[model samples]
Target: VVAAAEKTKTKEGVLYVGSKTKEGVVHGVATVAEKTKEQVTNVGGAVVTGVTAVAQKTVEGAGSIAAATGFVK
Candidate 1:
């Protein structure tokens, strides 16, 4: 009896059987899609920031080298 009752409670929380209903499947898909989008956006933003920093540093390095070599006025 207790085991049977437990089976019915499977959809009580965030985890659920997507096959149970169309709404359930849509909600699951939307949740996963939005979370994936967020993760990718975060990673892309980090990469852009890191690349920008590298470019800035490289420019500064070139300027320092130019000064050292008396290549600039």
Candidate 2:
């Protein structure tokens, strides 16, 4: 099962889902939406830019673990 926790930034609070795999490593991320029925329809340019920056930053740092996470890492 996925364990969820509330993560608040500046404006809105996101739901962070944390789960463990067979290897017993903990990894998770924050979501823009709080409710399952309600999803954030718009991922603005700033969020996109930030995500891109993270991708670029981790592009080299993530070697095999990235692939192990089904590219989700």
Candidate 3:
């Protein structure tokens, strides 16, 4: 447990292609933007494909199953 630079490329909120994080997403007309918001499935990350999420309005409660709700392309 000392591989600082070699740690996993994912964590709470990772945005990698099929990454092993909490959440992730993408879209063609994908419009990702977070302004004046606190959180929206940002904890475990989120899947925002096909345009999803907005104005801090997403959180799977205790776990934030935010993702698996976006990416529809």
Candidate 4:
């Protein structure tokens, strides 16, 4: 769970870095739909955050269930 949170932190950082770099370096180079860079970045940020939460929930939930059912420790 903790690792997933950390993963998301780094993932967000990467998104900003990559998106901004790509946008500033070459406008409309990605091809198809020339949307606003800021909005796209925000969208990526939201996805990253929620994606992290789900991953953490799943990992922790499995571990907890395991501890209760068999992997007591």
Q: Report, for all candidates in order, the number of backbone clashes.
A: 0, 0, 10, 0
Which one wins on TM-score? 3
Per-model TM-score versus the true fold:
0.10, 0.15, 0.17, 0.12
Compose the digit string of candidate 3's lDDT tens values, residues 5-73: 222334555443332445655543443666744323323345444333432444434332333433333
The pairs that clash in candidate 4 are: none
Q: Write the per-residue lDDT of candidate 1 for residues 1-73, one digit (tens) a residue.
A: 0111122225432432222333421221222364352332121111223211232232322221111212333
Distance (Å) between predicted and true CA of 61, model 3? 1.5
Indicate the worst ten consecutive residues by lDDT in candidate 3: 1-10
User: What's the C-alpha lDDT at position 50 in model 1?
Assistant: 22
Candidate order by TM-score, decreasing, is 3, 2, 4, 1
Q: Could you tell me the lDDT of residue 32 within candidate 4?
A: 44
lDDT of each: 0.24, 0.34, 0.39, 0.27
lDDT digits (tens) for residues 1-73 of candidate 2: 2333444558444455454445543223445555576443322212323211232233322232211122222
lDDT of 1: 0.24
lDDT of candidate 4 over 7-65, digit per residue (tens): 33235322222222323322322334465442221111112232122322334322321
Error of 4 at 59 (Å): 2.3
The whole-model C-alpha lDDT of candidate 4 against the native structure comes to: 0.27
Off by over 4 Å in 4: 1-37, 40-57, 61-73
Total colliding residue pairs, candidate 2: 0
